[PDB]
C-alpha cells in the first residue's frame, strides 16, 4: 500500500487502485485513486518553487541516485517484476538502463552549450556580441506507460532535475509502484522535494489535469497513438513531446553468409522477445529476403527454443509474462489469424494466462493483423520479402509508424541505401532497432511521434527556454 508522493509528502485518498501481479493475478499493492485536485496541488507547488541548485549540486543528486539504483537493484527489480511480470533478468536489465540515464544526466550537468554570435556581419552590422543561455520552465507534466516502469520515469525526471525544473509524474495505474519508489530514492539522494511529485489514479479523473493545468509549460508523454491524440487535442498552447508506438523491422539482406545468418538470428530473437516484446522499438517484423529465408528460419527456430519462459521471479527465466492475460490472448489470436491466412506456426508450446511463449511464425503476411496491429508481445514473426531492395524498403515504409529499424548486411552500398531510404528516426546496422545509448537522440516520425527528439541530451534542451542577451563590443 503506497500513497502518492507530493513534493516529499505522502498524500492518500479513500478509494484505491489495486495493482496485480500478472503471473498469478494476486494483488501486490494499492495506490490512491487520485483526482484532479491532487495534480492541481502538485503543479501549484512545482510552479511556486524556484530551484537554485548549482550544476555541481544537481550532479551530486543524480549520481547519488545512480549509485542508489545500483545498490538497491534486487529490491527495485522485484518491484518491477511484481507489477509488470517481466523476468528478473529483464527487470535487472531495466535497472541498469536507469543507472545509465542518471549517470549520463549527472555527467552532462558540467556542460554549457551556450553560443556566441559576432554581430558585424552584414551592412546592418553592429559592434556587438550575442550570447545564449538556458533557463528552466514553470512546471513539467510527465505521463508514462507500463513498458518500463522505472526507465520511462527516469528518462522524464533525470533531465528535469539536471535542468532545475519541477516535474509532476503520473505513471500508468498498471505499474505505479516503481515510480513511487524512485521518488523516495530521489528524495533520499537530496532532491529538493518540491522538484518532484508522483501522483496516481484512474485516467478519467486525474489525467486531464495533467494535460490542462495552467502551470504546465510542457507535457512529455510516452504511450499509444489514441492517447497521444487525446493529449494534443487538450494541451492546446503547451509544448509537447510525444513518443507514440513503433512497428520496427529487422531486415535481413541476401548477401549474408550462413555464419552471419546465425548472428542475425540471435538479433531477431533477442529483438522480438526482450522485455517480453514490450518495447516501442521491439522487433515486430522480421523482413527476410526470400533467397536466404530457408537457411535463416531454422536458425531462428533453434534459438527461440533455447529460451526459458515461465516464472518471472525465477532467476533462470529469460522470458516472463506480458502485461496481462487479455493482451496475451489477443496476441495469440493474431497469431492464429495469420496462420489462417498462410503463415506457418513453427513453435507454439502453448499459452498459460498472461504467459506467452516466444512463438515463431514463418511466412507471415505483411498485411496480417499480427504485424500491422501493435502486437506488443514476444511473437517472433518472419515476413519473407523480395530479393529486391527497392521493394523491401517500400514494404518496410508501408506502416503508419516510423521509429527505429535494424539492418543486417555487409554490403556498404546497400547499407547506405537503407540508411537513406528508410522512413524512420533511427537505422541500426547489425543491431536491433531498440539499440541506443541513453543520451543519443531518440524519436520517430509519422505516427511514432510529434516530431521532437528525446534521450538525455535532447530532453535537457527541450526542458529549457533559450534566452539570448547582447552587449556592446
Ligand X SMILES: NC(=O)c1ccc[n+]([C@@H]2O[C@H](COP(=O)([O-])OP(=O)(O)OC[C@H]3O[C@@H](n4cnc5c(N)ncnc54)[C@H](O)[C@@H]3O)[C@@H](O)[C@H]2O)c1
What mask, x for binding a second copy by CB under 8 A, covers residues 109 to 148?
Answer: --------x-x-xxxxxx-x-x-xx---------------
Task: List, in order, residues 6 or more apart from 367 with CB less than 8 Å away.
Answer: none
CA distances from 61 to 51, 154, 169 (A): 13, 13, 18
> Residue 237, interface with a second copy (CB under 8 A)?
yes
User: What are 348's three cell numbers?
Assistant: 507454439
For residue 462, give the nearest of 129, 198, 238 by alpha carbon.
238
In this structure, the strands spanning 116-118 and 27-32 are unpaired
Region near a second copy per CB under 8 A, out of 12-20, 154-162, 186-194, 231-239: 231-239
Could you tell which of ligand X, a second copy, none binds residue 143, using a CB distance below 5 to 8 A set by kind? ligand X
C-to-N gaps above 2.5 Å in the chain, after residues: none
Where does this chain bind ligand X (CB under 6 A)?
143-147, 170, 172-173, 203, 207, 210-211, 223-224, 227, 230
> Residue 437, interface with a second copy (CB under 8 A)?
yes
> Residue 229, interface with a second copy (CB under 8 A)?
yes
Q: How far is C-alpha 177 from the geometric centre of its chain's CA atoms?
A: 18
Q: Closer to ligand X at the Cβ: 235 or 393?
A: 235
> Residue 426, interface with a second copy (CB under 8 A)?
yes
What mask, x for binding a second copy by CB under 8 A, covers residues 201 to 220?
Answer: ----------------xx--
> CB-based burial of residue 241 (10 Å sphere; 0-12 exposed, 13-18 middle, 19+ buried)?
buried
> Residue 425, interface with a second copy (CB under 8 A)?
yes
Instruction: Go through the chain and tell me how many residues it has.
Output: 473
For residue 71, give the nearest of 48, 47, 102 by alpha carbon.
102
Task: List, in order, residues 6 or more apart from 249 with CB less than 8 Å away.
Answer: 283, 284, 285, 286, 287, 396, 405, 406, 433
Candidates 52, 226, 259, 469; binder of a second copy (CB under 8 A) is 469
Shortest Å, Cβ 237 to a second copy: 5
Shortest Å, Cβ 10 to a second copy: 33
> Residue 326, interface with a second copy (CB under 8 A)?
no
Task: List, in order, residues 6 or more apart from 438 with CB less than 8 Å away.
Answer: 97, 100, 101, 104, 155, 455, 456
Known binding site: residues? 97, 144-146, 148, 170-173, 224, 279-281, 374, 436
* Residues with active-site annotation: 243, 280
Q: Given the rule CB under 8 A, which residues bind a second copy?
A: 96-97, 99-100, 103-104, 117, 119, 121-126, 128, 130, 132-133, 217-218, 229, 232-233, 236-237, 239, 415, 419, 424-431, 435-443, 445, 450-453, 465-472
Amino acid at each position: 500500500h503506497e500513497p502518492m508522493r507530493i513534493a516529499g509528502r505522502l498524500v492518500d485518498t479513500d478509494d484505491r487502485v489495486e495493482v496485480r501481479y500478472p503471473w498469478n493475478d494476486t494483488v501486490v499493492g494499492t495506490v490512491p485513486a487520485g483526482r484532479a485536485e491532487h495534480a492541481r496541488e502538485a503543479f501549484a507547488i512545482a510552479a511556486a518553487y524556484q530551484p537554485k541548485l548549482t550544476r555541481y549540486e544537481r550532479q551530486k543528486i543524480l549520481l547519488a541516485t545512480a549509485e542508489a539504483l545500483a545498490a538497491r537493484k534486487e529490491e527495485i527489480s522485484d518491484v518491477i517484476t511484481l507489477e509488470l511480470g517481466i523476468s528478473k533478468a529483464d527487470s535487472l536489465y531495466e535497472v541498469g538502463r536507469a543507472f545509465d540515464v542518471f549517470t549520463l544526466a549527472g555527467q552532462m550537468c558540467i556542460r554549457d552549450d551556450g553560443e556566441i554570435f559576432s554581430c558585424d556581419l552584414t551592412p546592418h552590422g553592429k559592434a556587438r556580441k550575442i550570447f545564449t543561455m538556458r533557463e528552466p520552465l514553470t512546471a513539467i507534466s510527465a505521463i508514462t506507460p507500463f513498458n518500463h516502469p522505472l526507465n520511462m520515469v527516469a528518462h522524464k525526471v533525470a533531465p528535469a532535475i539536471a535542468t532545475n525544473n519541477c516535474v509532476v509524474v503520473k505513471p500508468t495505474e498498471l505499474t505505479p509502484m516503481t515510480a513511487l519508489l524512485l521518488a523516495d530514492i530521489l528524495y533520499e539522494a537530496g532532491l529538493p522535494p518540491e522538484m518532484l511529485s508522483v501522483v496516481t489514479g484512474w485516467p478519467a479523473d486525474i489525467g486531464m489535469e495533467m494535460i490542462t493545468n495552467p502551470h504546465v509549460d510542457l507535457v512529455t508523454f510516452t504511450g499509444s497513438v489514441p492517447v497521444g491524440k487525446l493529449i494534443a487535442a487538450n494541451a492546446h498552447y503547451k509544448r509537447q513531446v510525444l513518443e507514440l508506438g513503433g512497428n520496427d523491422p529487422l531486415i535481413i539482406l541476401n548477401d549474408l553468409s550462413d555464419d552471419d545468418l546465425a548472428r542475425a538470428a540471435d538479433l531477431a530473437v533477442a529483438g522480438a522477445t526482450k522485455n517480453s516484446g514490450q518495447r516501442c522499438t521491439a522487433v515486430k517484423r522480421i523482413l527476410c529476403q526470400e533467397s536466404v529465408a530457408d537457411r535463416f528460419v531454422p536458425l531462428v527456430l533453434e534459438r527461440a527454443k533455447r529460451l526459458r519462459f515461465g516464472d518471472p521471479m525465477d532467476r533462470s527465466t529469460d522470458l516472463g509474462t506480458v502485461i496481462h492475460e487479455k493482451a496475451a490472448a489477443l496476441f495469440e489470436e493474431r497469431v492464429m489469424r495469420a496462420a489462417e491466412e498462410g503463415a506457418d506456426i513453427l513453435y507454439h508450446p502453448g499459452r498459460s494466462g498472461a504467459l506467452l511463449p516466444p512463438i515463431v511464425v514463418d511466412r507471415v503476411p505483411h498485411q496480417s493483423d499480427l504485424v500491422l496491429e501493435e502486437t506488443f508481445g514476444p511473437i517472433i514473426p518472419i515476413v519473407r520479402v523480395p530479393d529486391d531492395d527497392d521493394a523491401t524498403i517500400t514494404l518496410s515504409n508501408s506502416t503508419a509508424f516510423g521509429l527505429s529499424s535494424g539492418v543486417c548486411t555487409n554490403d556498404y552500398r546497400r547499407m547506405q541505401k537503407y540508411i537513406a531510404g528508410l522512413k524512420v528516426g533511427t537505422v541500426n546496422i547489425w543491431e536491433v532497432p531498440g539499440y541506443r545509448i541513453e543520451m543519443s537522440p531518440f524519436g520517430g516520425i509519422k505516427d511514432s511521434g510529434n516530431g521532437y527528439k528525446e534521450g538525455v541530451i535532447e530532453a535537457m534542451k527541450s526542458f529549457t527556454n533559450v534566452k539570448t542577451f547582447s552587449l556592446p563590443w
